[PDB]
Each structure stands twice: as structure tokens, then as C-alpha cells.
Amino acid sequence: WQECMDYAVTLARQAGEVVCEAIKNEMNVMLKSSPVDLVTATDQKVEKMLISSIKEKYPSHSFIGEESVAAGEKSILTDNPTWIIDPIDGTTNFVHRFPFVAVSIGFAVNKKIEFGVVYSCVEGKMYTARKGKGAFCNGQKLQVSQQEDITKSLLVTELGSSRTPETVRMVLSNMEKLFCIPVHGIRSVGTAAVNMCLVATGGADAYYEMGIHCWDVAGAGIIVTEAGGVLMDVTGGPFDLMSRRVIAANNRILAERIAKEIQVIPLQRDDE
Amino acid sequence: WQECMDYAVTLARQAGEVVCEAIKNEMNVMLKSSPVDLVTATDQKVEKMLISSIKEKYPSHSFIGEESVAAGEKSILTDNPTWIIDPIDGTTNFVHRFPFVAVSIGFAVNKKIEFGVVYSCVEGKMYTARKGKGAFCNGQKLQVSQQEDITKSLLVTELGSSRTPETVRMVLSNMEKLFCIPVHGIRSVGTAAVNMCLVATGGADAYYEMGIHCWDVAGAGIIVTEAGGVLMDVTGGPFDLMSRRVIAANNRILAERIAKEIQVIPLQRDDE
Ligand SMILES: [Gd]
Ligand SMILES: [Gd]
Numbered sequence: 276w277q278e279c280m281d282y283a284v285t286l287a288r289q290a291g292e293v294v295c296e297a298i299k300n301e302m303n304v305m306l307k308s309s310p311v312d313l314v315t316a317t318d319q320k321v322e323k324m325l326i327s328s329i330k331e332k333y334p335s336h337s338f339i340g341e342e343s344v345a346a347g348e349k350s351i352l353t354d355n356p357t358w359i360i361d362p363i364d365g366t367t368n369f370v371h372r373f374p375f376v377a378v379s380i381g382f383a384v385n386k387k388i389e390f391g392v393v394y395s396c397v398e399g400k401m402y403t404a405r406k407g408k409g410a411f412c413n414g415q416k417l418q419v420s421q422q423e424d425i426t427k428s429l430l431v432t433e434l435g436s437s438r439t440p441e442t443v444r445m446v447l448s449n450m451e452k453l454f455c456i457p458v459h460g461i462r463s464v465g466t467a468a469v470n471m472c473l474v475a476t477g478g479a480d481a482y483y484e485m486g487i488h489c490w491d492v493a494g495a496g497i498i499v500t501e502a503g504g505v506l507m508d509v510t511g512g513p514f515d516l517m518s519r520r521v522i523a524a525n526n527r528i529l530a531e532r533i534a535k536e537i538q539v540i541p542l543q544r545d546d547e
Numbered sequence: 548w549q550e551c552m553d554y555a556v557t558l559a560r561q562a563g564e565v566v567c568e569a570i571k572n573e574m575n576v577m578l579k580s581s582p583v584d585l586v587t588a589t590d591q592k593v594e595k596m597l598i599s600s601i602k603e604k605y606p607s608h609s610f611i612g613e614e615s616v617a618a619g620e621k622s623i624l625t626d627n628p629t630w631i632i633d634p635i636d637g638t639t640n641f642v643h644r645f646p647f648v649a650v651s652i653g654f655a656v657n658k659k660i661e662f663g664v665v666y667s668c669v670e671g672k673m674y675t676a677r678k679g680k681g682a683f684c685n686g687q688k689l690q691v692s693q694q695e696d697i698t699k700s701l702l703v704t705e706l707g708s709s710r711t712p713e714t715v716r717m718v719l720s721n722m723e724k725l726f727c728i729p730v731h732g733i734r735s736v737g738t739a740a741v742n743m744c745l746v747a748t749g750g751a752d753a754y755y756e757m758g759i760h761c762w763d764v765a766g767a768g769i770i771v772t773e774a775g776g777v778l779m780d781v782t783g784g785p786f787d788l789m790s791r792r793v794i795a796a797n798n799r800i801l802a803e804r805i806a807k808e809i810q811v812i813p814l815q816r817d818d819e
Binding site: 310311313367368370371372373374398420426429434438440443444447450451454455457459460461462463464465473476477478479480 | 719
């Protein structure tokens with residue numbers, strides 16, 4: 276898989292320069308399923324670029340890409356080597372030129388993530404990890420923080436893509452409960468992958484979110500774990516890449532505490 | 548004032564260097580008015596260095612510094628040339644090694660901000676503005692976004708330092724109201740000064756917060772305005788530096804819509 280990985284880094288770095296030059300130009304913003312569900316020609320271009328290049332080199336491999344799913348493709352994960360991608364994690368940020376945008380690539384075999392590559396383009400920060408081999412950022416080794424007291428923690432989360440009153444109310448109510456424990460604070464950068472990378476560096480103690488997709492988390496998941504973190508479902512069960520829910524934390528104490536305080540939202544699985 | 552400004556820039560870089568070394572070291576974390584109201588020895592030494600360096604060149608100027616006020620110095624703003632400083636804007640970020648921390652220096656004459664310097668030390672971005680001269684980041688001129696439609700905007704805000712349930716509930720309901728217009732999103736990097744510089748670069752369309760202090764916004768206020776944006780009170784009225792409230796937007800159209808949607812939170816003024 277090292278070869279695939281080596282290749283993935285080169286691809287991500289390259290896709291990153293396309294995003295990077297694009298962010299300075301005018302964009303034709305399109306809508307997908309709602310007025311806040313955005314896409315640009317750059318997300319589509321980037322995904323097409325990634326997919327042709329990998330299939331050209333790994334014809335037998337499968338793909339799960341955000342925009343191809345939007346175009347008809349189905350997000351079912353088999354045992355087969357699969358490339359899980361969000362051409363631009365932080366699409367909204369991209370549209371606004373908010374400087375937190377990543378190319379996210381996760382590689383799964385036997386339905387378990389083997390490596391991950393997350394390229395925060397505007398900062399020129401390359402985050403990578405290979406199962407059993409470490410988490411790095413521009414060659415520097417990552418380690419999650421040591422914090423076991425929630426009352427001294429810094430959390431990351433996002434507001435979500437739903438604008439339905441009932442759902443928003445649940446998301447804010449979950450926030451409120453955490454906030455009031457109290458915790459040191461809550462931050463929101465606008466990208467699950469970047470948020471999770473902040474946990475892998477020890478900058479944030481934990482990230483949680485409900486409503487994400489497998490492409491948003493496939494790359495960064497392994498980076499948190501290889502940095503010494505844990506992935507868990509918000510239900511307190513085992514992390515499930517297709518569940519639309521995640522808790523990425525420095526340790527299991529913090530993760531179970533968060534699971535405890537928040538209420539789950541009903542969501543349609545990515546494999547349904 | 549150019550001279551003063553030229554000297555402020557130098558001091559910012561110097562203090563910026565102290566913060567950056569310290570961030571990777573073990574810290575002495577102390578409490579101020581509560582368990583979530585933090586201070587480190589770095590906050591204190593940077594502020595001391597700044598003031599003692601200023602007083603030396605300009606013995607007759609006045610100072611409003613966060614940690615000094617904390618120490619008994621009052622926060623009364625007079626016509627005298629006054630330096631308004633947050634030695635570390637984003638103290639909580641600093642304690643966690645969350646990479647958004649800034650040195651913020653505002654300089655006011657006749658109760659009006661004449662120039663501001665915000666150094667985001669970790670990113671290495673020097674933001675400066677001088678009334679009537681423009682706003683820059685590392686030598687590149689800034690300009691706010693042109694978005695006039697609230698439904699296509701990206702907002703930045705903070706949850707605040709209060710953990711009083713009534714208050715918390717007001718912050719979140721304010722958020723809910725904006726969220727549901729809907730707006731494209733809401734971000735939080737953990738520092739008023741950096742959040743405001745993101746508006747000045749056109750990365751975010753507007754920033755609002757109730758509960759900041761004059762030292763949190765004095766430096767960044769002039770950056771947004773010289774970038775072509777506006778400062779307004781939450782009433783839709785004129786910006787009042789000592790009021791603990793601000794709307795910093797690309798333009799008056801978005802500024803006024805936000806003012807129209809949010810409810811005021813009662814707070815003690817900096818001058819009370
Ligand atoms: Gd995306
Ligand atoms: Gd501070």
C-alpha cells in the first residue's frame with residue numbers, strides 16, 4: 276500500500292495547487308439539494324482529476340467520491356481497495372475564500388482504512404498517516420493532547436448542513452450542554468478533516484459531529500488514531516464510517532463523556 | 548503617528564516571537580474570574596514588555612491593557628493618545644496550542660482609533676491599518692467581500708466567556724436566528740482580532756459578538772474599516788468601543804440585517 280500512498284500524496288499535492296489557484300478566481304457556484312448545499316466546477320474538476328489518475332494506475336480499485344455520488348454513483352463499501360474522497364472538504368469555505376480547505380483521501384481495504392492523506396491547501400500543510408506507522412504533518416510526528424478532564428477541554432464541531440428547525444434545535448441543545456459543563460471553549464473551522472487534524476496535533480482535545488459523510492472523515496480518521504486518538508460513534512458504540520456520526524478524541528475518557536452529554540439525531544446511512 | 552505605528556509593528560513582532568516560543572513549552576495556567584477565565588505567565592510578561600517599551604519612548608501616552616485592568620488599572624478612555632492591548636488575543640487557544648493567537652495593539656487619539664496592528668504569530672501574518680492609508684497583511688492590501696445577500700454569507704462569532712445559562716441561551720438563540728435565515732455558515736477561530744481580520748480579507752462577510760472588551764477589538768476594528776468594511780453597534784447604531792458589543796461587516800447592508808435579527812445581551816461596559 277506504500278506505493279498507493281506515495282502516489283496519493285503526489286495526487287493530493289497536485290489537486291491542492293488546482294484548488295489553490297482556483298480560490299483566487301471567480302466561481303460559478305451551483306446548488307445541490309438546498310440553498311446551502313454548494314458545489315463549484317472546481318470540486319467537480321478536482322474529483323474527476325483524482326479519479327482518472329487513480330483508475331489509470333489502479334484499474335481494479337473502487338471509488339467513493341462526494342460529487343460522483345451526487346451524479347448517480349452509489350456509496351457502497353466492499354472489501355475491495357477503495358478510494359474515499361472529498362475533492363474539497365470545506366466546500367463552503369472554498370466558495371467564500373475562508374482559508375481552511377482540504378483535499379481528503381482515505382484508502383480502505385477489507386473495509387478498514389489503511390492510510391489517509393489530508394492536504395490543507397491554503398496553509399500548505401500535508402497531513403498523512405498509515406496504519407501502524409504514525410501521523411505526520413510536513414514530516415513532523417503528531418500526538419494528541421493528554422487532557423482527561425472535560426472541564427479543561429477545547430472542542431471542535433460544526434453546525435451542520437441542515438436548516439430544519441427541529442434538527443438545528445437539537446444541534447444547539449447538544450452544544451449548550453457541552454458548553455455548560457463547562458468546557459474551555461468550542462471552535463468551528465468549517466471542515467471535518469481539518470477539524471480532525473487539529474485533534475491529531477493536540478490543538479483541540481476532541482471533535483464530534485452528526486451529519487457528516489464517509490468522504491469527510493475517511494482521510495482524517497486514521498490521522499487522529501495514529502496520533503494516539505480514538506474514533507467512536509456518538510451513540511458510544513464503535514466508529515462506523517457509513518453512520519454519518521463521529522467522535523474523534525484524544526482518549527476514550529473524553530469521548531465517552533461527550534457521548535454521554537449529547538443526544539443522537541436520526542440520519543440516513545451512507546450505505547442506504 | 549507613523550513613527551508610533553512603525554514602532555508598534557516592531558513591538559508586535561518581538562512579542563509575537565515570545566508567544567511562539569512559549570506555545571510549545573509547558574505553561575503555568577492560572578484562573579482569573581472563573582475556571583474558564585484563563586491567564587498564563589506569557590500573557591503577563593508580554594503585556595509588561597509592551598507597556599514598559601512604549602512608556603519609554605512615549606512617556607505621556609495612556610494604556611488600557613487586559614492584564615493591567617485585571618490588576619486594578621481602570622478602563623476609562625480619554626482623548627489622550629492611548630494604547631489598547633490584548634497581549635494575547637485568543638488566550639484560551641494559547642493554553643491549548645490551538646493555532647490562532649494574536650498580539651493586538653490599537654492606538655487611539657481623541658477617542659478614535661488611528662492605527663491598529665494584529666500579529667497572528669503562529670501563522671506569521673502581520674495585519675496593519677492606519678486611518679486613511681489602507682489595510683495590509685504582510686504587505687498585501689486587503690479588501691472586504693462584496694456580498695450583499697445575507698442568504699449567501701459566511702459569519703464568524705464566538706460563544707463568549709460566560710457560562711450563565713440565561714446568557715448562554717441568548718447567545719445560542721441569536722445564532723439560531725441567523726443560522727436559519729439561512730446563511731451559508733458560521734465559524735469561530737477563538738479570537739475576536741483574528742475573526743475580524745478574516746472579515747478584512749474577505750474570507751468571512753461579517754463578525755458579531757456581545758461580551759468582548761475594547762482590547763479585543765481596538766486593533767482589528769481599523770483593519771476592517773480600512774479594508775472597506777464597517778463597525779456598528781448591535782442596535783444598528785454607531786460603534787461604541789467601550790460597549791462590549793460589535794458588528795464588523797463587509798458593508799452596511801449585512802451589518803444592519805444582523806442587527807435586526809439579534810437580541811441584545813445586557814453587559815457591564817468597560818467604562819462601568
Ligand atoms: Gd466537499
Ligand atoms: Gd487575552
